[model samples]
Target: MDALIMAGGKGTRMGGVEKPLIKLCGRCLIDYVVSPLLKSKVNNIFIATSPNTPKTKEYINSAYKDYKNIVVIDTSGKGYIEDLNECIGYFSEPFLVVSSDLINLKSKIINSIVDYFYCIKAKTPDVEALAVMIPKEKYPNPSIDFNGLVPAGINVVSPKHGYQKEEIMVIDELIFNINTKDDLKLAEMLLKKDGL
Candidate 1:
Protein backbone atom coordinates (compact mmCIF):
# COMPACT_ATOMS: atom_id res chain seq x y z
CA MET A 1 0.00 0.00 0.00
CA ASP A 2 1.03 3.61 -0.63
CA ALA A 3 0.37 6.62 1.57
CA LEU A 4 -0.45 10.32 1.36
CA ILE A 5 0.00 12.95 4.03
CA MET A 6 -2.61 15.67 3.52
CA ALA A 7 -0.84 18.90 4.47
CA GLY A 8 -2.26 21.34 1.95
CA GLY A 9 -4.69 23.22 4.16
CA LYS A 10 -4.39 26.99 4.77
CA GLY A 11 -4.29 26.35 8.57
CA THR A 12 -6.26 29.44 9.40
CA ARG A 13 -6.81 28.18 12.96
CA MET A 14 -3.17 27.58 13.80
CA GLY A 15 -2.34 31.18 14.64
CA GLY A 16 0.59 31.79 12.24
CA VAL A 17 2.08 28.38 11.56
CA GLU A 18 0.57 26.13 8.91
CA LYS A 19 -1.30 23.03 10.04
CA PRO A 20 1.29 20.43 9.11
CA LEU A 21 4.12 22.62 10.30
CA ILE A 22 2.65 23.18 13.72
CA LYS A 23 4.81 21.87 16.52
CA LEU A 24 3.68 19.30 19.04
CA CYS A 25 6.02 18.99 22.00
CA GLY A 26 8.65 20.67 19.78
CA ARG A 27 8.20 18.21 16.92
CA CYS A 28 6.51 18.95 13.61
CA LEU A 29 2.92 17.80 13.58
CA ILE A 30 3.49 15.98 10.31
CA ASP A 31 5.88 13.63 12.11
CA TYR A 32 3.01 12.08 14.03
CA VAL A 33 1.43 11.07 10.74
CA VAL A 34 4.57 10.16 8.76
CA SER A 35 7.10 8.65 11.18
CA PRO A 36 5.26 5.37 11.44
CA LEU A 37 4.62 5.00 7.72
CA LEU A 38 8.33 5.28 7.07
CA LYS A 39 8.80 2.06 8.97
CA SER A 40 5.78 0.24 7.53
CA LYS A 41 5.56 -1.90 4.40
CA VAL A 42 4.42 0.95 2.20
CA ASN A 43 6.86 1.60 -0.63
CA ASN A 44 6.34 5.33 -1.03
CA ILE A 45 4.80 8.28 0.74
CA PHE A 46 3.32 11.42 -0.86
CA ILE A 47 2.63 14.78 0.69
CA ALA A 48 -0.33 16.53 -0.92
CA THR A 49 -0.02 20.30 -0.72
CA SER A 50 -1.47 23.33 -2.40
CA PRO A 51 -0.23 26.77 -3.46
CA ASN A 52 -1.78 27.84 -0.17
CA THR A 53 1.04 26.14 1.73
CA PRO A 54 4.28 26.75 -0.12
CA LYS A 55 6.30 27.01 3.04
CA THR A 56 4.83 23.73 4.24
CA LYS A 57 5.72 22.20 0.88
CA GLU A 58 9.26 23.46 1.22
CA TYR A 59 9.56 22.15 4.75
CA ILE A 60 8.39 18.72 3.71
CA ASN A 61 10.90 18.54 0.87
CA SER A 62 13.76 19.55 3.09
CA ALA A 63 12.77 17.54 6.12
CA TYR A 64 12.21 14.36 4.12
CA LYS A 65 15.13 14.83 1.75
CA ASP A 66 16.69 11.70 3.19
CA TYR A 67 13.81 9.61 1.88
CA LYS A 68 13.88 8.88 -1.85
CA ASN A 69 10.22 8.03 -2.48
CA ILE A 70 8.66 10.76 -0.36
CA VAL A 71 6.89 13.03 -2.84
CA VAL A 72 5.55 16.52 -2.35
CA ILE A 73 2.61 17.49 -4.57
CA ASP A 74 1.13 20.85 -5.41
CA THR A 75 -2.66 20.83 -5.64
CA SER A 76 -3.13 24.49 -6.58
CA GLY A 77 -4.86 25.16 -3.19
CA LYS A 78 -7.99 23.65 -4.72
CA GLY A 79 -9.47 22.43 -1.40
CA TYR A 80 -9.58 18.90 0.06
CA ILE A 81 -11.63 16.94 -2.44
CA GLU A 82 -10.00 18.55 -5.43
CA ASP A 83 -6.49 18.20 -4.09
CA LEU A 84 -7.08 14.60 -3.05
CA ASN A 85 -8.39 13.78 -6.52
CA GLU A 86 -5.39 15.41 -8.10
CA CYS A 87 -2.87 13.47 -6.01
CA ILE A 88 -4.63 10.12 -6.49
CA GLY A 89 -3.15 9.98 -10.00
CA TYR A 90 0.37 9.40 -8.65
CA PHE A 91 -0.35 6.01 -7.10
CA SER A 92 -1.36 2.74 -8.77
CA GLU A 93 -2.49 1.07 -5.54
CA PRO A 94 -5.07 1.77 -2.90
CA PHE A 95 -3.80 4.53 -0.58
CA LEU A 96 -4.34 5.83 2.91
CA VAL A 97 -4.43 9.44 4.11
CA VAL A 98 -4.22 11.29 7.43
CA SER A 99 -4.96 14.91 8.05
CA SER A 100 -2.01 17.04 9.12
CA ASP A 101 -3.42 18.42 12.33
CA LEU A 102 -4.57 15.20 13.97
CA ILE A 103 -3.05 14.99 17.47
CA ASN A 104 -3.91 11.50 18.70
CA LEU A 105 -2.03 9.77 15.88
CA LYS A 106 -0.39 6.44 16.58
CA SER A 107 1.20 3.73 14.44
CA LYS A 108 -1.13 1.00 15.65
CA ILE A 109 -4.05 2.98 14.21
CA ILE A 110 -2.51 2.87 10.72
CA ASN A 111 -1.75 -0.80 11.09
CA SER A 112 -5.35 -1.54 12.05
CA ILE A 113 -6.78 0.51 9.21
CA VAL A 114 -4.64 -1.15 6.56
CA ASP A 115 -5.64 -4.55 7.88
CA TYR A 116 -9.27 -3.47 7.76
CA PHE A 117 -8.91 -2.35 4.16
CA TYR A 118 -7.75 -5.75 2.93
CA CYS A 119 -10.49 -7.51 4.84
CA ILE A 120 -13.10 -5.50 2.98
CA LYS A 121 -11.22 -6.05 -0.26
CA ALA A 122 -11.45 -9.82 0.11
CA LYS A 123 -15.20 -9.76 0.66
CA THR A 124 -16.42 -6.82 -1.42
CA PRO A 125 -14.04 -6.26 -4.31
CA ASP A 126 -16.10 -3.25 -5.35
CA VAL A 127 -15.75 -1.66 -1.92
CA GLU A 128 -13.34 1.06 -2.90
CA ALA A 129 -13.54 2.84 0.42
CA LEU A 130 -12.91 1.56 3.93
CA ALA A 131 -13.20 4.31 6.49
CA VAL A 132 -11.73 3.91 9.99
CA MET A 133 -14.06 5.73 12.27
CA ILE A 134 -14.20 6.12 16.04
CA PRO A 135 -17.89 5.46 16.62
CA LYS A 136 -19.38 8.47 18.36
CA GLU A 137 -22.73 9.07 19.93
CA LYS A 138 -23.14 12.41 18.17
CA TYR A 139 -23.08 13.48 14.53
CA PRO A 140 -20.94 16.07 12.77
CA ASN A 141 -19.93 17.25 9.26
CA PRO A 142 -21.94 18.94 6.53
CA SER A 143 -24.94 16.97 5.30
CA ILE A 144 -23.02 13.90 6.36
CA ASP A 145 -24.22 11.56 9.07
CA PHE A 146 -22.73 8.28 10.21
CA ASN A 147 -25.21 5.67 11.31
CA GLY A 148 -24.10 6.15 14.91
CA LEU A 149 -20.47 7.10 14.64
CA VAL A 150 -18.00 9.80 13.60
CA PRO A 151 -14.71 9.59 11.65
CA ALA A 152 -11.37 9.93 13.37
CA GLY A 153 -8.62 10.61 10.82
CA ILE A 154 -6.78 7.53 9.53
CA ASN A 155 -8.64 6.30 6.44
CA VAL A 156 -8.00 3.87 3.61
CA VAL A 157 -9.70 4.60 0.31
CA SER A 158 -9.37 3.32 -3.21
CA PRO A 159 -8.45 5.92 -5.80
CA LYS A 160 -12.04 5.56 -6.99
CA HIS A 161 -13.89 5.97 -3.66
CA GLY A 162 -11.89 8.81 -2.00
CA TYR A 163 -12.34 9.75 1.77
CA GLN A 164 -12.84 7.84 5.04
CA LYS A 165 -12.41 8.91 8.66
CA GLU A 166 -10.63 7.25 11.62
CA GLU A 167 -7.28 8.82 12.46
CA ILE A 168 -8.47 11.57 14.79
CA MET A 169 -9.28 11.61 18.52
CA VAL A 170 -11.96 13.66 20.16
CA ILE A 171 -9.75 14.20 23.17
CA ASP A 172 -7.82 16.40 20.78
CA GLU A 173 -9.53 19.47 19.37
CA LEU A 174 -9.70 18.47 15.70
CA ILE A 175 -12.88 16.36 16.03
CA PHE A 176 -14.93 19.42 15.18
CA ASN A 177 -14.03 23.05 14.45
CA ILE A 178 -14.14 23.71 18.18
CA ASN A 179 -10.99 25.02 19.94
CA THR A 180 -7.59 24.16 18.53
CA LYS A 181 -5.81 25.96 21.31
CA ASP A 182 -6.84 23.03 23.45
CA ASP A 183 -4.99 20.84 20.99
CA LEU A 184 -1.83 22.85 21.32
CA LYS A 185 -2.15 23.03 25.06
CA LEU A 186 -2.84 19.32 25.38
CA ALA A 187 0.12 18.54 23.19
CA GLU A 188 2.31 20.57 25.47
CA MET A 189 1.13 18.53 28.40
CA LEU A 190 1.99 15.33 26.59
CA LEU A 191 5.35 16.78 25.78
CA LYS A 192 6.09 17.47 29.41
CA LYS A 193 4.54 14.33 30.84
CA ASP A 194 6.19 11.49 28.96
CA GLY A 195 7.37 12.79 25.57
CA LEU A 196 6.61 11.52 22.05
Candidate 2:
Protein backbone atom coordinates (compact mmCIF):
# COMPACT_ATOMS: atom_id res chain seq x y z
CA MET A 1 0.00 0.00 0.00
CA ASP A 2 1.01 3.62 -0.52
CA ALA A 3 0.87 6.42 2.10
CA LEU A 4 0.37 10.18 2.03
CA ILE A 5 1.43 12.34 4.95
CA MET A 6 -0.61 15.55 5.06
CA ALA A 7 1.74 18.30 6.12
CA GLY A 8 0.50 21.22 4.09
CA GLY A 9 -1.76 22.93 6.58
CA LYS A 10 -1.21 26.61 7.45
CA GLY A 11 -1.58 25.88 11.18
CA THR A 12 -3.12 29.23 11.99
CA ARG A 13 -3.95 28.00 15.46
CA MET A 14 -0.30 27.16 15.98
CA GLY A 15 0.70 30.82 15.64
CA GLY A 16 1.93 30.42 12.08
CA VAL A 17 4.51 27.82 13.13
CA GLU A 18 4.82 24.87 10.79
CA LYS A 19 3.18 22.15 12.84
CA PRO A 20 5.08 19.44 10.94
CA LEU A 21 8.39 21.03 11.81
CA ILE A 22 7.68 21.49 15.50
CA LYS A 23 10.00 19.30 17.55
CA LEU A 24 8.57 16.83 20.01
CA CYS A 25 10.92 14.96 22.31
CA GLY A 26 13.78 16.26 20.19
CA ARG A 27 12.22 14.97 16.94
CA CYS A 28 10.35 16.79 14.21
CA LEU A 29 6.60 16.19 14.36
CA ILE A 30 6.64 14.66 10.87
CA ASP A 31 9.50 12.40 11.90
CA TYR A 32 7.32 10.42 14.26
CA VAL A 33 4.76 9.85 11.51
CA VAL A 34 7.22 9.04 8.75
CA SER A 35 9.44 6.70 10.80
CA PRO A 36 6.52 4.38 11.39
CA LEU A 37 5.47 4.42 7.71
CA LEU A 38 8.99 3.50 6.64
CA LYS A 39 8.73 0.39 8.81
CA SER A 40 5.19 -0.51 7.76
CA LYS A 41 3.75 -2.33 4.72
CA VAL A 42 3.55 0.98 2.84
CA ASN A 43 5.60 1.16 -0.38
CA ASN A 44 5.42 4.74 -1.63
CA ILE A 45 5.34 7.57 0.90
CA PHE A 46 4.01 10.85 -0.46
CA ILE A 47 4.37 13.93 1.72
CA ALA A 48 2.07 16.80 0.82
CA THR A 49 3.51 20.26 1.42
CA SER A 50 2.57 23.74 0.28
CA PRO A 51 3.82 27.30 0.15
CA ASN A 52 2.72 27.69 3.75
CA THR A 53 5.13 24.97 4.73
CA PRO A 54 8.17 25.52 2.56
CA LYS A 55 10.45 24.95 5.52
CA THR A 56 8.70 21.70 6.22
CA LYS A 57 9.25 20.64 2.60
CA GLU A 58 12.92 21.48 2.93
CA TYR A 59 13.12 19.61 6.21
CA ILE A 60 11.60 16.45 4.71
CA ASN A 61 13.83 16.75 1.67
CA SER A 62 17.09 16.92 3.64
CA ALA A 63 15.97 14.66 6.45
CA TYR A 64 14.78 11.75 4.34
CA LYS A 65 17.15 12.33 1.43
CA ASP A 66 18.45 8.76 1.57
CA TYR A 67 15.01 7.18 1.38
CA LYS A 68 14.17 6.56 -2.29
CA ASN A 69 10.49 5.89 -1.63
CA ILE A 70 9.80 9.23 0.05
CA VAL A 71 8.43 11.92 -2.28
CA VAL A 72 7.28 15.45 -1.44
CA ILE A 73 4.35 16.74 -3.47
CA ASP A 74 3.50 20.44 -3.52
CA THR A 75 -0.16 21.31 -3.05
CA SER A 76 -2.20 24.51 -3.35
CA GLY A 77 -2.34 25.04 0.45
CA LYS A 78 -6.05 25.59 0.11
CA GLY A 79 -7.68 23.46 2.79
CA TYR A 80 -7.48 19.93 4.20
CA ILE A 81 -10.12 18.33 2.03
CA GLU A 82 -9.00 20.14 -1.10
CA ASP A 83 -5.36 19.12 -0.62
CA LEU A 84 -6.43 15.59 0.24
CA ASN A 85 -8.50 15.35 -2.95
CA GLU A 86 -5.49 16.46 -4.94
CA CYS A 87 -3.14 14.00 -3.27
CA ILE A 88 -5.46 11.05 -3.88
CA GLY A 89 -4.56 11.03 -7.58
CA TYR A 90 -0.97 10.11 -6.78
CA PHE A 91 -1.80 6.47 -5.94
CA SER A 92 -3.44 3.83 -8.15
CA GLU A 93 -4.17 1.44 -5.30
CA PRO A 94 -5.51 2.31 -1.89
CA PHE A 95 -3.29 4.73 0.03
CA LEU A 96 -3.05 5.65 3.67
CA VAL A 97 -3.64 9.26 4.75
CA VAL A 98 -1.98 10.37 7.95
CA SER A 99 -1.46 13.71 9.66
CA SER A 100 2.13 14.69 10.32
CA ASP A 101 1.31 15.67 13.92
CA LEU A 102 0.29 12.22 15.12
CA ILE A 103 3.16 11.73 17.52
CA ASN A 104 2.37 8.25 18.80
CA LEU A 105 1.58 6.46 15.54
CA LYS A 106 3.37 3.12 15.75
CA SER A 107 4.24 0.84 12.86
CA LYS A 108 2.22 -1.96 14.42
CA ILE A 109 -0.87 0.24 14.50
CA ILE A 110 -0.35 1.24 10.87
CA ASN A 111 -0.10 -2.40 9.82
CA SER A 112 -3.22 -3.18 11.80
CA ILE A 113 -5.19 -0.46 10.00
CA VAL A 114 -3.98 -1.80 6.65
CA ASP A 115 -4.95 -5.30 7.70
CA TYR A 116 -8.39 -4.12 8.71
CA PHE A 117 -8.87 -2.38 5.35
CA TYR A 118 -8.09 -5.57 3.45
CA CYS A 119 -10.39 -7.65 5.64
CA ILE A 120 -13.29 -5.26 5.14
CA LYS A 121 -12.64 -4.87 1.40
CA ALA A 122 -12.71 -8.65 0.99
CA LYS A 123 -16.18 -8.82 2.50
CA THR A 124 -17.40 -5.54 0.95
CA PRO A 125 -15.60 -5.06 -2.32
CA ASP A 126 -17.25 -1.69 -2.89
CA VAL A 127 -15.80 -0.20 0.26
CA GLU A 128 -13.41 2.41 -1.12
CA ALA A 129 -11.97 3.78 2.12
CA LEU A 130 -11.32 3.00 5.77
CA ALA A 131 -10.77 5.39 8.65
CA VAL A 132 -9.13 4.68 11.98
CA MET A 133 -10.79 6.57 14.79
CA ILE A 134 -10.52 6.82 18.54
CA PRO A 135 -13.12 7.66 21.11
CA LYS A 136 -13.47 11.41 21.67
CA GLU A 137 -12.45 10.81 25.26
CA LYS A 138 -8.95 9.98 24.06
CA TYR A 139 -8.41 13.29 22.26
CA PRO A 140 -11.14 15.77 23.00
CA ASN A 141 -10.25 18.41 20.43
CA PRO A 142 -11.15 16.52 17.29
CA SER A 143 -12.14 18.35 14.11
CA ILE A 144 -14.08 15.38 12.67
CA ASP A 145 -16.43 13.35 14.80
CA PHE A 146 -18.57 10.27 14.21
CA ASN A 147 -21.06 9.71 17.02
CA GLY A 148 -18.75 9.78 20.03
CA LEU A 149 -15.66 8.76 18.06
CA VAL A 150 -13.16 11.06 16.39
CA PRO A 151 -10.83 10.64 13.43
CA ALA A 152 -7.35 9.54 14.38
CA GLY A 153 -5.89 11.23 11.30
CA ILE A 154 -5.18 7.80 9.83
CA ASN A 155 -7.17 6.74 6.78
CA VAL A 156 -7.03 4.41 3.79
CA VAL A 157 -8.49 5.57 0.48
CA SER A 158 -8.95 3.43 -2.64
CA PRO A 159 -9.60 6.49 -4.86
CA LYS A 160 -11.83 4.45 -7.15
CA HIS A 161 -14.72 6.87 -7.75
CA GLY A 162 -16.96 9.52 -6.26
CA TYR A 163 -18.70 9.23 -2.89
CA GLN A 164 -16.44 6.42 -1.71
CA LYS A 165 -17.77 4.11 0.93
CA GLU A 166 -15.90 4.73 4.18
CA GLU A 167 -15.47 2.23 6.99
CA ILE A 168 -14.60 3.31 10.50
CA MET A 169 -12.34 1.45 12.92
CA VAL A 170 -12.11 2.57 16.53
CA ILE A 171 -8.79 1.82 18.16
CA ASP A 172 -7.43 2.36 21.68
CA GLU A 173 -4.25 4.15 20.74
CA LEU A 174 -3.84 7.84 21.61
CA ILE A 175 -2.76 9.63 18.39
CA PHE A 176 -1.66 12.85 20.15
CA ASN A 177 -2.33 15.25 17.27
CA ILE A 178 -0.80 18.66 17.92
CA ASN A 179 -2.84 21.57 16.61
CA THR A 180 -1.81 24.30 19.04
CA LYS A 181 0.90 25.30 21.44
CA ASP A 182 -0.92 23.69 24.34
CA ASP A 183 -1.21 20.45 22.45
CA LEU A 184 2.55 20.39 21.93
CA LYS A 185 3.18 20.94 25.63
CA LEU A 186 0.77 18.18 26.49
CA ALA A 187 2.45 15.85 24.05
CA GLU A 188 5.80 16.58 25.61
CA MET A 189 4.51 15.69 29.05
CA LEU A 190 2.75 12.62 27.73
CA LEU A 191 5.90 11.45 26.01
CA LYS A 192 7.91 11.77 29.22
CA LYS A 193 5.35 9.68 31.04
CA ASP A 194 4.85 7.28 28.12
CA GLY A 195 1.17 8.19 28.17
CA LEU A 196 0.71 8.45 24.40
Candidate 3:
Protein backbone atom coordinates (compact mmCIF):
# COMPACT_ATOMS: atom_id res chain seq x y z
CA MET A 1 0.00 0.00 0.00
CA ASP A 2 0.96 3.65 -0.44
CA ALA A 3 0.85 6.39 2.20
CA LEU A 4 0.48 10.19 2.27
CA ILE A 5 1.54 12.07 5.37
CA MET A 6 0.23 15.65 5.73
CA ALA A 7 3.06 17.40 7.60
CA GLY A 8 2.69 21.02 6.53
CA GLY A 9 1.23 22.68 9.63
CA LYS A 10 2.98 25.75 11.05
CA GLY A 11 2.51 24.39 14.59
CA THR A 12 2.03 27.86 16.05
CA ARG A 13 0.73 26.38 19.29
CA MET A 14 3.56 23.86 19.59
CA GLY A 15 5.92 26.47 20.96
CA GLY A 16 6.56 27.50 17.35
CA VAL A 17 8.27 24.17 16.61
CA GLU A 18 7.21 22.19 13.57
CA LYS A 19 4.87 19.58 14.98
CA PRO A 20 6.22 16.78 12.79
CA LEU A 21 9.78 17.55 13.77
CA ILE A 22 8.97 17.73 17.46
CA LYS A 23 10.90 15.07 19.35
CA LEU A 24 9.32 12.49 21.59
CA CYS A 25 11.50 9.99 23.45
CA GLY A 26 14.48 11.09 21.31
CA ARG A 27 12.69 10.52 17.99
CA CYS A 28 10.92 13.02 15.79
CA LEU A 29 7.12 12.90 15.94
CA ILE A 30 6.97 12.05 12.25
CA ASP A 31 9.20 9.04 12.82
CA TYR A 32 6.76 7.54 15.26
CA VAL A 33 3.83 8.24 12.96
CA VAL A 34 5.55 6.76 9.92
CA SER A 35 7.09 3.68 11.54
CA PRO A 36 3.80 1.79 11.65
CA LEU A 37 3.18 2.34 7.95
CA LEU A 38 6.67 1.21 7.04
CA LYS A 39 6.17 -1.93 9.09
CA SER A 40 2.85 -2.57 7.34
CA LYS A 41 4.55 -3.08 3.96
CA VAL A 42 3.66 0.33 2.58
CA ASN A 43 6.36 0.93 -0.01
CA ASN A 44 5.24 4.31 -1.32
CA ILE A 45 5.41 6.89 1.45
CA PHE A 46 4.85 10.53 0.55
CA ILE A 47 5.45 13.38 2.98
CA ALA A 48 3.58 16.62 2.23
CA THR A 49 5.43 19.44 3.93
CA SER A 50 5.42 23.24 3.70
CA PRO A 51 7.80 24.66 1.13
CA ASN A 52 8.63 27.58 3.38
CA THR A 53 10.01 25.37 6.17
CA PRO A 54 13.50 24.46 5.00
CA LYS A 55 14.04 22.91 8.38
CA THR A 56 11.12 20.56 7.86
CA LYS A 57 12.46 19.49 4.47
CA GLU A 58 15.99 19.08 5.79
CA TYR A 59 14.81 17.03 8.73
CA ILE A 60 12.83 14.68 6.53
CA ASN A 61 15.69 14.31 4.08
CA SER A 62 18.29 13.60 6.72
CA ALA A 63 16.07 11.20 8.62
CA TYR A 64 14.76 9.26 5.64
CA LYS A 65 17.56 9.61 3.13
CA ASP A 66 18.38 5.92 3.09
CA TYR A 67 14.80 4.81 2.80
CA LYS A 68 14.06 4.35 -0.89
CA ASN A 69 10.34 4.02 -0.35
CA ILE A 70 9.89 7.57 0.92
CA VAL A 71 9.19 10.75 -1.05
CA VAL A 72 9.01 14.28 0.30
CA ILE A 73 6.88 16.88 -1.50
CA ASP A 74 6.50 20.55 -0.72
CA THR A 75 2.94 21.71 -0.25
CA SER A 76 2.42 24.66 -2.58
CA GLY A 77 -0.61 25.87 -0.63
CA LYS A 78 -1.37 26.32 3.06
CA GLY A 79 -4.06 24.16 4.65
CA TYR A 80 -3.86 20.44 5.25
CA ILE A 81 -6.59 19.70 2.73
CA GLU A 82 -4.98 21.90 0.12
CA ASP A 83 -1.58 20.23 0.57
CA LEU A 84 -3.21 16.83 0.44
CA ASN A 85 -5.02 17.68 -2.78
CA GLU A 86 -1.74 18.90 -4.25
CA CYS A 87 0.03 15.67 -3.32
CA ILE A 88 -2.66 13.22 -4.44
CA GLY A 89 -1.67 13.47 -8.06
CA TYR A 90 1.52 11.54 -7.27
CA PHE A 91 -0.39 8.36 -6.48
CA SER A 92 -2.38 6.45 -9.09
CA GLU A 93 -3.41 3.66 -6.77
CA PRO A 94 -5.56 3.71 -3.66
CA PHE A 95 -3.48 5.34 -0.95
CA LEU A 96 -3.60 5.92 2.78
CA VAL A 97 -3.53 9.51 4.09
CA VAL A 98 -2.58 10.35 7.65
CA SER A 99 -1.54 13.31 9.77
CA SER A 100 1.99 13.66 11.09
CA ASP A 101 0.82 14.80 14.50
CA LEU A 102 -0.91 11.64 15.68
CA ILE A 103 0.69 10.00 18.73
CA ASN A 104 -1.32 6.83 19.21
CA LEU A 105 -1.71 5.62 15.66
CA LYS A 106 -0.63 2.00 15.11
CA SER A 107 -0.07 -0.53 12.36
CA LYS A 108 -3.06 -2.54 13.46
CA ILE A 109 -5.32 0.47 13.09
CA ILE A 110 -3.86 1.35 9.69
CA ASN A 111 -4.22 -2.24 8.48
CA SER A 112 -7.80 -2.27 9.71
CA ILE A 113 -8.60 0.79 7.64
CA VAL A 114 -7.01 -0.84 4.60
CA ASP A 115 -9.13 -3.91 5.17
CA TYR A 116 -12.22 -1.75 5.41
CA PHE A 117 -11.38 -0.13 2.10
CA TYR A 118 -11.11 -3.50 0.41
CA CYS A 119 -14.40 -4.58 1.96
CA ILE A 120 -16.07 -1.49 0.55
CA LYS A 121 -14.40 -2.03 -2.79
CA ALA A 122 -15.75 -5.56 -2.89
CA LYS A 123 -19.35 -4.54 -2.28
CA THR A 124 -19.13 -1.38 -4.32
CA PRO A 125 -16.29 -1.25 -6.78
CA ASP A 126 -16.70 2.48 -7.02
CA VAL A 127 -16.14 3.19 -3.32
CA GLU A 128 -13.80 6.18 -3.13
CA ALA A 129 -12.86 6.65 0.48
CA LEU A 130 -12.90 5.02 3.93
CA ALA A 131 -11.78 5.89 7.48
CA VAL A 132 -11.04 4.32 10.86
CA MET A 133 -12.75 5.29 14.09
CA ILE A 134 -11.50 5.43 17.68
CA PRO A 135 -14.01 5.12 20.49
CA LYS A 136 -14.19 7.44 23.52
CA GLU A 137 -13.05 4.71 25.91
CA LYS A 138 -9.80 4.50 23.97
CA TYR A 139 -9.06 8.18 24.52
CA PRO A 140 -6.60 8.90 27.31
CA ASN A 141 -8.95 11.47 28.77
CA PRO A 142 -12.56 11.30 27.80
CA SER A 143 -14.31 14.66 27.57
CA ILE A 144 -18.01 15.11 28.13
CA ASP A 145 -17.99 18.60 26.66
CA PHE A 146 -16.87 17.27 23.30
CA ASN A 147 -18.14 14.26 21.38
CA GLY A 148 -16.04 11.18 22.14
CA LEU A 149 -15.85 9.78 18.63
CA VAL A 150 -12.52 10.67 16.97
CA PRO A 151 -10.86 10.21 13.62
CA ALA A 152 -7.59 8.29 13.85
CA GLY A 153 -6.14 10.72 11.24
CA ILE A 154 -5.83 7.71 8.96
CA ASN A 155 -7.90 7.49 5.78
CA VAL A 156 -7.94 5.29 2.67
CA VAL A 157 -8.80 7.06 -0.55
CA SER A 158 -8.84 6.05 -4.19
CA PRO A 159 -7.90 8.38 -7.01
CA LYS A 160 -11.46 7.98 -8.16
CA HIS A 161 -12.60 10.00 -5.13
CA GLY A 162 -12.06 13.10 -7.27
CA TYR A 163 -11.33 15.23 -4.23
CA GLN A 164 -10.96 18.82 -5.40
CA LYS A 165 -8.28 21.24 -4.16
CA GLU A 166 -10.58 23.12 -1.77
CA GLU A 167 -13.33 20.54 -1.41
CA ILE A 168 -11.87 17.87 0.81
CA MET A 169 -14.00 15.89 3.25
CA VAL A 170 -12.66 14.57 6.51
CA ILE A 171 -13.74 10.94 6.52
CA ASP A 172 -14.19 10.35 10.24
CA GLU A 173 -14.89 12.21 13.48
CA LEU A 174 -12.41 10.37 15.71
CA ILE A 175 -9.32 11.95 14.16
CA PHE A 176 -8.16 14.93 16.20
CA ASN A 177 -6.02 17.63 14.66
CA ILE A 178 -3.40 18.97 17.06
CA ASN A 179 -3.87 22.70 16.63
CA THR A 180 -3.00 24.08 20.09
CA LYS A 181 -0.47 23.71 22.85
CA ASP A 182 -2.99 21.87 24.98
CA ASP A 183 -3.69 19.51 22.12
CA LEU A 184 0.01 18.63 21.79
CA LYS A 185 0.30 18.12 25.52
CA LEU A 186 -2.73 15.87 25.50
CA ALA A 187 -1.27 13.89 22.63
CA GLU A 188 2.06 13.50 24.40
CA MET A 189 0.31 12.26 27.52
CA LEU A 190 -1.77 9.86 25.48
CA LEU A 191 1.29 8.58 23.65
CA LYS A 192 3.20 7.91 26.84
CA LYS A 193 0.24 6.28 28.52
CA ASP A 194 -0.50 4.07 25.54
CA GLY A 195 3.18 2.99 25.28
CA LEU A 196 2.90 3.18 21.49
Better of 2 and 3 by TM-score: 2
Put the candidates in lDDT order, highest first.
2, 3, 1
Which residue pairs does candidate 1 place in steric collision? 132-166, 152-166, 152-167, 152-168, 153-166, 153-167, 153-168, 154-166, 154-167
Clashing pairs in 2: none
Model 1 worst lDDT window (10 residues): 170-179
Q: Model 3, range 1-196, lDDT digits (tens) per residue?
A: 7888766654312323346777765677678788877777577788877766657678888999997888887884247556656656656787787867666556767767777677767877766777655665564444343355555557776654347222122333343335456666766676677775
Q: Which ten residues in a row have the lowest lDDT in candidate 2?
A: 9-18
Number of clashing residue pairs, candidate 3: 6
Candidate 2 residue-wise lDDT at 77: 43
Candidate 1 per-residue C-alpha lDDT over 128-156 given as tens digits, one digit per residue, 9 for 90 to 100? 66665555445333223444554566666
Instruction: Show pairs that collide, candidate 3.
Output: 150-173, 150-174, 150-175, 151-173, 151-174, 151-175
* TM-score of every prediction relative to native: 0.74, 0.83, 0.74
Off by over 4 Å in 1: 10-18, 135-150, 161-179
Cα RMSD for candidates in order = 5.6, 3.5, 5.1
Q: Model 2 — TM-score against the truth?
A: 0.83
